[PDB]
Amino acid sequence: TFITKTPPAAVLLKKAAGIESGSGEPNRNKVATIKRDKVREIAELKMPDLNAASIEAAMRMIEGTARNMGIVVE
RNA sequence: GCCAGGAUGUAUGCUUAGAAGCAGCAAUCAUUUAAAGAGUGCGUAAUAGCUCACUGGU
Ligand SMILES: [Co+3]
Ligand SMILES: [K+]
Ligand SMILES: [Mg+2]
Ligand SMILES: [Mg+2]
Ligand SMILES: [Mg+2]
Ligand SMILES: [Mg+2]
Ligand SMILES: [Mg+2]
Ligand SMILES: [Mg+2]
Ligand SMILES: [Mg+2]
Ligand SMILES: [Mg+2]
Ligand SMILES: [Mg+2]
Ligand SMILES: [Mg+2]
């Protein structure tokens, strides 16, 4: 019955990306780049907080958070 | 018109004493949907709160 809340998708991303802060211009300045297998884990870990059906959709959300903060996936 | 929803990653990222849809900057993705803007106004120190777009009902 004790709800353990997971860290925001954003911070989880910075962590995995090895960066102090996200980009101020997400489209122009890309601060870092990570991998799909990493978005994989973030989506898997954060899953309880999400409202997604599958992990593909979960990752779709995570990528959206990363896309909007200058992070890139490969 | 009235009734009811108007959600979720998320207080997006940045910046900023604070900046949580709504000072300002760059963006404006994604999920679950019948539908629901990275938010139309009002509101708060910042929250909260009221509200619209949008959806269903009558
Ligand atoms: Co939509
Ligand atoms: K703000
Ligand atoms: Mg109403
Ligand atoms: Mg209401
Ligand atoms: Mg939101
Ligand atoms: Mg922030
Ligand atoms: Mg400055
Ligand atoms: Mg803002
Ligand atoms: Mg509100
Ligand atoms: Mg304001
Ligand atoms: Mg602007
Ligand atoms: Mg809404």
Side-chain angles (χ1 to χ4, degrees), chain A residues 4-60:
Chain A
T4 305
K5 208 171 184 187
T6 60
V11 30
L12 278 172
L13 278 168
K14 292 181 175 189
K15 176 98 170 174
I19 52 173
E20 224 247 297
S21 287
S23 176
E25 317 91 86
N27 61 307
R28 308 186 195 151
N29 290 100
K30 273 51 175 64
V31 54
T33 75
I34 52 171
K35 293 184 180 179
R36 324 218 93 286
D37 302 85
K38 287 305 296 75
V39 175
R40 210 94 201 168
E41 297 179 318
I42 299 179
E44 294 182 309
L45 169 66
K46 186 78 175 178
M47 199 62 232
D49 291 25
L50 304 167
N51 72 331
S54 52
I55 295 183
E56 359 293 305
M59 287 183 284
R60 231 84 60 46

